[PDB]
Ligand SMILES: Cc1cc2nc3c(=O)[nH]c(=O)nc-3n(C[C@H](O)[C@H](O)[C@H](O)COP(=O)(O)O)c2cc1C
Ligand SMILES: CCOC(=O)c1[nH]cc(Cc2ccc(C(F)(F)F)c3ncoc23)c1C
């Protein structure tokens with residue numbers, strides 16, 4: 298009930314959301330969100346997640362199939378509050394070895410009528426050292442909090458603006474924060490770091506994945522060890538860009554199979570949406586509803602190109618339970634949200650979980666795992 302108690306669907310946060318989306322700068326609303334979470338003002342979802350909507354990627358056991366995508370909590374300043382809204386996992390970052398301010402503001406803009414966002418942030422983050430300290434503090438609180446014992450935390454890693462070879466920055470981050478991550482997400486798909494997406498070329502991508510895997514394996518040798526949720530070394534995911542041709546996607550699939558990567562995040566923002574009058578002026582990558590179809594088709598292609606052997610984390614225009622089921626039936630095992638929290642507020646997780654559960658029931662699925670890839 299929106300009015301009777303304090304909970305994710307509390308009516309006042311919807312009043313706030315309407316005021317924010319109409320009058321307040323996008324990045325300012327997001328900072329206010331994080332401040333409320335940093336001081337544990339936001340409401341909790343203490344509901345038991347349905348046993349039939351759980352999912353997994355190898356040993357990662359997601360209590361439910363909805364997490365928060367990278368770029369929402371870049372520095373891990375309110376990991377607890379975001380998770381407690383009802384999410385099973387969060388991807389902090391993307392982080393860089395040293396801190397950097399990013400591109401000039403304003404750099405985030407929303408189109409409410411199309412439920413779309415465009416951003417040109419440029420990997421703004423406090424730096425690997427400080428974000429590592431932020432994550433360690435969460436891991437210590439997690440061991441005591443019975444609401445977070447099974448929640449998953451991944452770390453997205455990139456490179457600083459003036460780094461020549463990306464692997465040098467990735468290796469630094471892994472040795473600093475890898476011990477506290479349940480998985481590592483390699484960001485070679487940001488459209489706001491010039492030249493980053495070139496690293497999706499098969500040759501460079503293979504070298505990057507293998508270098509990241511070796512550094513994670515070296516953490517074990519060089520060094521209680523795994524202060525994370527799984528108590529195992531982090532898995533390795535790659536986050537891919539949607540603006541690729543079929544031959545690019547096929548050679549990427551061959552690399553992902555050859556390197557035994559643990560999963561792929563499909564996908565990052567697109568630069569190929571010029572349908573939004575309000576974004577005419579603007580630079581950066583686009584998120585939200587206008588990315589949904591692009592991202593779902595991309596999931597179908599990679600699911601087939603990898604012969605269903607690489608688990609998929611879905612990202613792009615997921616707002617409703619039907620949207621999530623589309624991603625799942627396309628080949629995704631788990632979903633990430635971002636734009637949904639921007640346009641629907643604190644109730645995003647509670648609402649979408651209920652919609653998905655009622656849909657799996659309406660469609661005749663016994664559980665979510667049964668729906669993975671059923672479109673094929
Ligand atoms: C303001 C903003 C910042 C983002 N920062 C990152 C980031 O740092 N690393 C990353 O991998 N993705 C980043 N993303 C992309 C999102 O993680 C997500 O892949 C994308 O928004 C598509 O999901 P959506 O349609 O639900 O918003 C960012 C997106 C936005 C809008
Ligand atoms: C481009 C991304 O930045 C954003 O626009 C953004 N990020 C998160 C949100 C959602 C949100 C933010 C602040 C509050 C408030 F009022 F409680 F502080 C909210 N209440 C309900 O939803 C709220 C938004 C709009």
Ligand SMILES: O=C(O)c1cc(=O)[nH]c(=O)[nH]1
Nearest residue numbers: 418419420487489566582
């Ligand atoms: O930091 C950014 O500018 C950024 C990174 C990324 O991976 N995706 C995105 O849309 N923006």
